[PDB]
Amino acid sequence: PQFSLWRRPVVTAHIEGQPVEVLLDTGADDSIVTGIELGPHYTPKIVGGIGGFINTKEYKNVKIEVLGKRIKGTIMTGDTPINIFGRNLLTALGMSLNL
Amino acid sequence: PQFSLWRRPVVTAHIEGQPVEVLLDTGADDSIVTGIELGPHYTPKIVGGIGGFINTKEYKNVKIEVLGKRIKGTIMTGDTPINIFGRNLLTALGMSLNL
Numbered sequence: 001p002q003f004s005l006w007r008r009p010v011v012t013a014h015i016e017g018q019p020v021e022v023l024l025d026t027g028a029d030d031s032i033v034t035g036i037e038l039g040p041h042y043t044p045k046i047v048g049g050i051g052g053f054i055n056t057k058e059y060k061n062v063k064i065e066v067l068g069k070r071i072k073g074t075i076m077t078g079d080t081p082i083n084i085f086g087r088n089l090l091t092a093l094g095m096s097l098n099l
Numbered sequence: 100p101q102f103s104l105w106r107r108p109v110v111t112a113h114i115e116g117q118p119v120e121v122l123l124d125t126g127a128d129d130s131i132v133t134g135i136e137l138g139p140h141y142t143p144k145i146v147g148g149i150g151g152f153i154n155t156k157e158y159k160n161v162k163i164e165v166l167g168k169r170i171k172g173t174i175m176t177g178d179t180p181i182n183i184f185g186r187n188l189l190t191a192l193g194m195s196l197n198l
């Protein structure tokens with residue numbers, strides 16, 4: 001898998017069985033997703049960026065299958081315009097930015 | 100170079116001579132920076148981010164020297180909390196996201 005980046009690096013991930021489209025973001029410290037409900041045990045958290053900050057619901061031990069791999073990881077749920085797979089999951093997949 | 104992503108892929112860039120700390124961002128289609136002076140021949144653009152939109156001044160063909168390569172591209176000036184070098188400049192550098 002190599003993303004040349006001429007187009008957004010989006011891929012399909014299965015987060016606890018749900019297919020979700022996701023952007024591979026090296027500029028994101030965390031992974032935020034909308035549209036999937038992961039349940040009642042989470043930690044309110046806040047994440048910020050261009051535009052401001054949003055409130056998120058942080059989940060642990062989330063089962064995700066992306067690019068042919070199955071990893072367990074932390075996902076945040078919240079008011080996001082696009083689903084993001086941040087650096088915490090990209091390191092878990094062994095993905096790297098190269099020049 | 101290879102940037103594994105255990106820490107933020109922040110690098111040093113010179114935008115028309117001016118140095119600035121920049122985040123190489125695959126989740127950014129555009130490059131937005133702040134604290135750099137540019138040529139008042141800009142066109143107002145709007146840029147969306149996590150939780151919001153900010154007012155931007157768009158400059159075309161700005162000369163940039165980053166990661167030892169000289170490049171040219173559109174950079175947006177705005178009150179961004181993080182200086183971002185998006186895909187328009189990453190592709191120009193020849194960067195790739197790899198698994």
Ligand SMILES: COC(=O)[C@@H](NC(=O)[C@@H](NC(=O)CC[C@H](O)[C@H](Cc1ccccc1)NC(=O)[C@H](C)NC(=O)[C@H](C)N)C(C)C)C(C)C
Nearest residue numbers: 027028029047048049050081082126127128129147148149
């Ligand atoms: C916990 O600490 C934090 O929250 C840290 N924040 C971060 O790490 C945040 N990183 C970030 O906020 C880094 C920026 C992200 O990569 C977003 C992703 C995005 C794309 C499209 C639409 C919406 C959002 N890109 C953008 O905002 C770019 C400028 N937008 C665009 O390219 C538009 C869509 N053309 C994440 C929370 C998303 C910190 C740097 C403040």
